[PDB]
Design a binder for this molecule. Structure first.
Ligand SMILES: CCCCCCCCCCCCCCCCCC(=O)OC[C@H](COP(=O)([O-])OCC(O)COP(=O)([O-])OC[C@@H](COC(=O)CCCCCCCCCCCCCCCCC)OC(=O)CCCCCCCCCCCCCCCCC)OC(=O)CCCCCCCCCCCCCCCCC
Ligand SMILES: CCCCCCCCCCCCCCCCCC(=O)OC[C@H](COP(=O)([O-])OCC(O)COP(=O)([O-])OC[C@@H](COC(=O)CCCCCCCCCCCCCCCCC)OC(=O)CCCCCCCCCCCCCCCCC)OC(=O)CCCCCCCCCCCCCCCCC
Ligand SMILES: CCCCCCCCCCCCCCCCCC(=O)OC[C@H](COP(=O)([O-])OCC(O)COP(=O)([O-])OC[C@@H](COC(=O)CCCCCCCCCCCCCCCCC)OC(=O)CCCCCCCCCCCCCCCCC)OC(=O)CCCCCCCCCCCCCCCCC
Ligand SMILES: CCCCCCCCCCCCCCCC(=O)OC[C@H](COP(=O)([O-])OCC[N+](C)(C)C)OC(=O)CCCCCCCCCCCCCCC
Ligand SMILES: CCCCCCCCCCCCCCCC(=O)OC[C@H](COP(=O)(O)OCCN)OC(=O)CCCCCCCCCCCCCCC
Ligand SMILES: CCCCCCCCCCCCCCCC(=O)OC[C@H](COP(=O)(O)OCCN)OC(=O)CCCCCCCCCCCCCCC
Ligand code: HEM
Ligand code: HEM
Ligand code: HEM
Ligand SMILES: COc1c(O)c(C)c(C/C=C(/C)CC/C=C(\C)CC/C=C(\C)CC/C=C(\C)CC/C=C(\C)CCC=C(C)C)c(O)c1OC
Lengths: 76, 431, 126, 110, 57, 110, 62, 126
């Protein structure tokens, strides 16, 4: 058949940002979320508040953070 | 439409077209510039100008025939064009002037005059044709020390040593029945052409062509022919592409169509639906560019060629064009693929469906010497239509994302940065 | 940063309504007189901020005679304000002279930029 | 153009440590200038953190340094870093000045 | 395969950076424990814990 | 817009500098004003109490706090001087504005 | 000599040129440098922060 | 900072004294051999500092073919030094090739500059 016109629509967007570009970038923006949690654990390892609720419950790397000094060896 | 027969070693293929006003016949050999060595480079260029010599072409004009010849990396062709009904004389001319009798053409004062003219054709090509001599150095640096690196026109230093005895060696090794296809295009029937060939002897040599030891392999490298007296800069940049007999042959071709060509001095070229244009137009970065996808028997090349007068912002031009290549792996859209589909079908329908039977003969003969047949235009349209966005992303992630590149340039190219700065742009740290 | 296309769309609806025109237009005339830019020898179209691409396009396409006159009104206003005075009453801009001379050029440039944004985000059906 | 060249603040970074055109022949003696920049940063940061525990009265100055070594956590690391870092500051500076004396870096244009 | 190794860890920078951080977390705890163990063993009999238990006999 | 945002940063740094110097007198308002500002950070849901201990250097406003507040009151003014230069750099791009609110490119004086 | 004759580079070239194999080798060595640099940065930040918590003599009077 | 006019004045006096030319030249040939610039592919005239106005005119007036060759020798030495090696012994500059090609263009530019200074301080014998 003969075509005499083009049929089209307009995609949802706001400025330089579009819905299609957001959908393509969405799976990779979650990996960057997980790469920032991993980098946060590295820098808060010495914080004892985070040790007692998160890091000491790791199966193999957990117990190696516990201190085993007897009370008779501590002045405070 | 294409009909292909076999006869004792030679292959006959035709593309009949009754509406044509001119028939064309000739012979296409399946050996080209990639079948020479760095010491006999330019032999196939001498054989082309010997065929089109003044004395040879004067004989053809009396009968009303016109001659043509083309030299490529893989094939060379010799064509004779004439009016319909004069096809019998064209076959006769080809037989007794090139196929069976080469002694009269290879006489002295005819070889010495032709060699004088070709030596001048390559001297001015090497110092006047800049865009086409950086695309030749791109092949030279990307396929160095492999057969796919020798220029098709030959070398000035190599052509001063060729003698008449070198031309007979090449003819004995390559102009053979097992390396040849007889073609006929325009207003000529398949039955008529094959009947004429068998009515005569029309037999080439008997031996087989020598095989090449090493195949072509891509190497990331660069060559810089800096010249501060020229007014512009010409740059070619490419990655390894696809061979002719590949499943990703049409996907790579469609990928080059997404970025396309550009002319700064054409009002309608500045309105194209290419997202790269809005980056390079605020500051005039280049005068023109084109994206290509060249395929051969062993390998290919995929990239672009540029020419600019903005010599202080070459880095900006390269940075922006390579950042758009990255989106072919991560964020290419559905509208871009649909537009490139329509423009590729138009471009293919303007190359195979032109009005020149000489152009058709080269195209048809070269496609049969490689895969034994010719794919129709209707079937190719069905393959282009089937391409999806997931196909493009898979192909780009394999060939483009974080890969080695080849660079060639000449002119004022001080502003072109080093290899490592450019190669860093083949990927993004934000992804 | 409200588009002039949006201002014109709202403004026209008021002017074509007989009820709204009689209650809103009298207020707008008193609003303009109290603003007092005419007492410095300026039209309103001289007050629009110009540091954007849309207004740089419109000012490029303005005819030379209009462009020369606008440059004189702007220079005169800077020197009058420098002295902390007003212009003499006979040099003030009249109401019939305060016409939107630059508005048609602004609307034409705004319509082109909107159609470019709707074609860059096009989606082909079927 | 690129955002690294158009921005007001990034263009000073780009023009000094990114796109700066350097000769291709400079050897490792041209590395002492960047080392002196790291020495100055080390001395400032260790001095500030030590100054939170220091008293300048002549009756408490000596004892405040002994307080840093013993009572402050990792305080001996800060003090030995600051005292030895100042010795390494003059080591590099002496070699930095002798490089320019050997290679004539004091001559006319500079 | 070497193609699968590149596709999993080296193609996306997010996975490459996340792997470096997760490898630094494991290295941090293991390196400390292995150093004190060697240091204590090299000085057996000179530590307070050693002499405290001896006088406790 | 960028010139406006740098000024907001300068405003924040100036408030902190004035507060730190007011504590260096250690009067009745100085002491008691510091235990109602530093105690504000104790309201953070997690590790809010650990922050105030690290800021105090102890269990309340005491000798560790006053000695470290003087070291910071010496430093922040030099950071302010560095952001003023960045303030002037962003102004020099398009120049200043005028009370008329229109372009000033037609009449300029040095 | 022509400009299409590339010089000799065989003394520095590697016999096997695999993109996947030769890129994984290079990224393993820049990822090892970044792993140890990341661990050394945590040590440096913690040393300075910890010197501000509470001295030994203050903790004695708790 | 010592002018080539003064350098040549002392040098030419030495080279014309039979006694002085007998002991100075043999120790000058050994001095040049130990300097070692010929082992990088350089002539002495390529080592002269060029950031003065006098040497900028001399390099401007140098014939075009000699100027192209000088650019290759300078780029070659930078690449050789970058590798911490020397050039192969067959590529070393020989004694008969180490000629003062730029010297005439320096002595002529210096003479013109000296005459200008003498003419700005002219005193007519009135
Ligand atoms: C350094 C200081 C400031 C950083 C700026 C970097 C300099 C630069 O060149 O930036 C411009 C640069 C592009 O500039 P250009 O290519 O030179 O030319 C201008 C283009 O027209 C620009 O156009 P475009 O289309 O290329 O820009 C789109 C882009 C940018 O568009 C924007 O302008 C968006 C806003 C950017 C800045 C946000 C504030 O959109 C995005 O933001 C997409 C990327 C988002 C993914 C973020 C990935 C990194 C996550 C960080 C976490 C890692 C930390 C690990 C854990 C930490 C340790 C505990 O932008 C980026 O590369 C984006 C950076 C990612 C944002 C975070
Ligand atoms: C000092 C070292 C010199 C820095 C030079 C360098 O890294 O390459 C410059 C490199 C060359 O610039 P360009 O090719 O014109 O820009 C490329 C595009 O912007 C597009 O660049 P792109 O798409 O490759 O990424 C832009 C960049 C933007 O970086 C962000 O800030 C985000 O994104 C990231 O790097 C995000 C990943 C960072 C996560 C690592 C977490 C570790 C903590 O630019 C960048 O990648 C960064 C912008 C320039 C330097 C920023 C400030 C450095 C000075 C301090
Ligand atoms: C003891 C020297 C023995 C080495 C030898 O036989 O070569 C002599 C060799 C002969 O000299 P040349 O290579 O003809 O000229 C010296 C180049 O300018 C120097 O050019 P370059 O950058 O190639 O030399 C760097 C040099 C030494 O690099 C430096 O100049 C750096 C100096 C050390 C400062 C870096 C850390 C600062 C620590 C604070 C204290 O490093 C080496 O010698 C390593 C290759 C062996 O001299 C040296 O390489 C100097 C070594 C003295 C230390
Ligand atoms: C802020 C508190 C910690 C203060 C401490 C400051 C930092 C101290 C050192 C921290 C080191 C952190 C290492 C981060 C991970 C890493 O090693 O680098 C990963 C990437 C390397 O990626 P690539 O080399 O470009 O190759 C990628 C190829 N793909 C995957 C894209 C196909 O690289 C990147 O993505 C960019 C990382 C750039 C980090 C450089 C930091 C330099 C800071 C000093 C600035 C001097 C001036
Ligand atoms: C979330 C959006 C991130 C990915 C979007 C995307 O889509 O990535 C970005 C796309 C990539 O798209 P591209 O691959 O086509 O161009 C690739 C170019 N070569 O660029 C754009 O859209 C430009 C607009 C980005 C959206 C701006 C986001 C600003 C908000 C973040 C900062 C503020 C945080 C909130 C603070 C309270
Ligand atoms: C910040 C200002 C600049 C300072 C630069 C100092 C340069 C001098 C370095 C030479 C001696 C090291 C002293 C540091 C000692 C230390 O801090 O820690 C010592 C740690 C081990 O100690 P630990 O992990 O058991 O914990 C300590 C108990 N709280 O050794 C290391 O990890 C060596 C790694 C050093 C690499 C630093 C890389 C630069 C990072 C910049 C971050 C910003
Ligand atoms: C904190 C002190 C200093 C710092 C941070 C510093 C920094 C630098 C840097 C980064 C460079 C360029 C890189 C290099 O040449 O290595 C440099 C070059 C130079 N510096 Fe310094 N410098 C300092 C002190 C000095 C001193 C004391 C002198 C001389 C008395 C000096 C004289 C020079 C000279 C002459 C050069 C140029 C040399 C050349 O490029 O050939 N500097 N400086
Ligand atoms: C280039 C910068 C600096 C240099 C070269 C330098 C040098 C020195 C030297 C040599 C000492 C003697 C230490 C000893 O012998 O044990 C010292 C002590 C000291 N410095 Fe610095 N200093 C610098 C910066 C600073 C700054 C910026 C501060 C504070 C903000 C500071 C604070 C101190 C203190 C508190 C001491 C006390 C003694 C000690 O702790 O050892 N320093 N400095
Ligand atoms: C923007 C710069 C500064 C501001 C806004 C500022 C503000 C203040 C304020 C509000 C006080 C309280 C005084 C009172 O209430 O009686 C003070 C005290 C003090 N400041 Fe500053 N200051 C600045 C810079 C500096 C600098 C750079 C130094 C030292 C190098 C300094 C040293 C002192 C001292 C020693 C006191 C002791 C208390 C007094 O003398 O009243 N100030 N400052
Ligand atoms: C390789 O390229 C380079 C190069 O990258 C660099 C950096 C330099 C060095 C150049 C410079 C100009 C040196 C830069 C440094 C300075 C001018 C001085 C540095 C200043 C500081 C370190 C001051 C910063 C101080 C602090 C942040 C104070 C710390 C205290 C804190 C955080 C207190 C804790 C906070 C609270 C609320 C309790 C080069 O010479 C160079 O070669 C060309």
């Amino acid at each position: 058949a003969y075509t005499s016109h083009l049929s089209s629509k307009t995609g949802l967007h706001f400025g330089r940002l579009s819905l299609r570009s957001l959908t393509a970038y969405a799976p990779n923006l979650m990996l960057w979320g997980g790469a920032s949690m991993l980098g946060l654990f590295v820098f808060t390892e010495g914080w004892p508040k985070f040790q007692d609720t998160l890091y000491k419950k790791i199966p193999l790397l957990g117990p190696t953070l516990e201190d085993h000094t007897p009370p008779e060896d501590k002045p405070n | 439409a294409e009909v292909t027969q076999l006869s004792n070693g030679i292959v006959v293929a035709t593309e009949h077209n009754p509406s044509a006003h001119t028939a064309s016949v000739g012979v296409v050999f399946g050996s080209g510039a990639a079948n020479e060595n760095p010491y006999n480079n330019g032999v196939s260029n001498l054989w082309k100008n010997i065929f089109l010599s003044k004395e040879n072409s004067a004989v053809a004009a009396k009968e009303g025939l016109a001659l043509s010849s083309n030299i490529s990396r893989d094939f060379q062709s010799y064509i004779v064009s004439s009016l319909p009904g004069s096809t019998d004389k064209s076959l006769d001319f080809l037989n007794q002037s090139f196929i069976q009798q080469k002694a009269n053409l290879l006489s002295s004062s005819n070889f010495e005059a032709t060699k004088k003219s070709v030596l001048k054709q390559v001297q001015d090509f090497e110092e006047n044709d800049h865009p086409n001599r950086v695309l030749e150095h791109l092949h030279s640096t990307a396929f160095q020390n492999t057969p796919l690196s020798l220029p098709t026109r030959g070398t000035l230093e190599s052509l001063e040593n060729l003698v008449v005895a070198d031309l007979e060696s090449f003819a004995n090794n390559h102009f053979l029945n097992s390396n040849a296809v007889v073609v006929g295009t325009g207003n000529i029937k398949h039955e008529d052409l094959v009947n004429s060939i068998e009515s005569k002897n029309l037999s080439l040599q008997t031996g087989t062509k020598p095989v090449l030891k090493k195949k072509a392999a891509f190497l990331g490298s660069e060559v810089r022919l800096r010249d501060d007296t020229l007014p512009k800069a010409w740059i070619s940049l490419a990655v390894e592409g696809e061979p002719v007999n590949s499943p990703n042959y049409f996907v790579a071709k469609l990928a080059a169509q997404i970025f396309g060509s550009y002319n700064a001095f054409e009002p309608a070229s500045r309105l194209q639906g290419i997202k790269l244009l809005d980056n390079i137009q605020e500051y005039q970065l280049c005068d023109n560019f084109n994206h290509f996808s060249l395929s051969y028997k062993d390998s290919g090349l995929w990239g672009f060629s540029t020419a600019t007068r903005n010599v202080t912002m070459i880095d900006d031009l390269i940075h922006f064009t390579l950042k758009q290549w990255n989106r072919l792996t991560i964020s290419v859209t559905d509208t871009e693929v649909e537009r490139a589909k329509s423009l590729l079908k138009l471009q293919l329908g303007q190359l195979y469906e032109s009005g020149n039977p000489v152009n058709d003969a080269n195209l048809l003969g070269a496609e049969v010497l490689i895969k034994g047949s010719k794919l129709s235009l209707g079937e190719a349209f069905k393959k282009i239509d089937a391409i999806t966005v997931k196909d493009v992303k898979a192909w780009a992630g394999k060939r483009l994302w974080d890969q080695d590149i080849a660079i060639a340039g000449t002119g004022q190219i001080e502003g072109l940065l080093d290899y490592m700065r450019i190669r860093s742009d083949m990927s993004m740290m934000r992804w | 940063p409200q588009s002039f296309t949006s201002i014109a769309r709202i403004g026209d609806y008021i002017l074509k309504s007989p009820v709204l025109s009689k209650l809103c237009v009298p207020v707008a005339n008193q609003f303009i007189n109290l603003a007092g830019y005419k007492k410095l020898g300026l039209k309103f179209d001289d007050l629009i901020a110009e540091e954007n691409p849309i207004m740089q396009t419109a000012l490029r396409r303005l005819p030379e005679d209009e462009s020369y006159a606008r440059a004189y009104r702007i220079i005169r206003a800077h020197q009058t304000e420098l002295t902390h005075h007003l212009l003499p009453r006979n040099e003030w801009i009249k109401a019939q002279e305060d016409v939107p001379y630059l508005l048609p050029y602004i609307l034409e440039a705004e319509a082109a930029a909107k159609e470019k944004d709707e074609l860059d985000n096009i989606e082909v059906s079927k | 153009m690129a955002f690294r060249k158009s921005n007001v603040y990034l263009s000073l970074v780009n023009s000094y440590i990114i796109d700066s055109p350097q000769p291709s022949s400079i050897n490792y003696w041209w590395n002492m200038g960047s080392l002196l920049g790291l020495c100055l940063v080390i001395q400032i940061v260790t001095g500030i953190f030590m100054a939170m525990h220091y008293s300048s009265n002549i009756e408490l100055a000596f004892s405040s340094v002994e307080h840093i070594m013993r009572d402050v956590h990792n305080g001996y690391i800060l003090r030995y870093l600051h005292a030895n870092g100042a010795s390494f500051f003059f080591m590099v500076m002496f070699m930095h000045m002798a490089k320019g004396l050997y290679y004539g870096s004091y001559r006319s244009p500079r | 395969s070497f193609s699968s190794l590149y596709k999993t860890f080296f193609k996306r920078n997010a996975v490459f950076v996340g792997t470096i951080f997760a490898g630094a977390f494991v290295f941090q705890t293991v390196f400390d424990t292995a150093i004190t163990s060697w240091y204590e063993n090299h000085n057996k009999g000179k530590l307070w814990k050693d002499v405290k238990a001896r006088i406790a006999a | 817009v960028t010139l406006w945002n740098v000024g907001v940063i300068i405003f924040i740094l100036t408030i902190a500098t004035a507060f730190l110097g007011y504590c260096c007198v250690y009067g009745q308002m100085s002491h008691w004003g510091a235990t109602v500002i530093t105690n504000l950070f104790s309201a953070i849901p997690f590790v809010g109490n650990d922050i105030v201990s690290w800021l105090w250097g102890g269990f309340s406003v005491s000798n560790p706090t006053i000695q470290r507040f003087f070291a910071l009151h010496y430093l922040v003014p030099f950071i302010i001087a560095a952001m003023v230069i960045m303030h002037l750099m962003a102004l020099h791009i398009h120049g200043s504005s005028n009370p008329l609110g229109i372009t000033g490119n037609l009449d300029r004086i040095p | 000599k022509s400009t299409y004759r590339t010089p000799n580079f065989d003394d520095v070239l590697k016999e096997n040129n695999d993109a996947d194999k030769g890129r994984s080798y290079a990224y393993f060595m820049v990822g090892a440098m970044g792993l140890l640099s990341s661990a050394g940065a945590k040590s440096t930040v913690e040393t300075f922060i910890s010197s501000m918590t509470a001295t030994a003599d203050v903790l004695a009077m708790a």
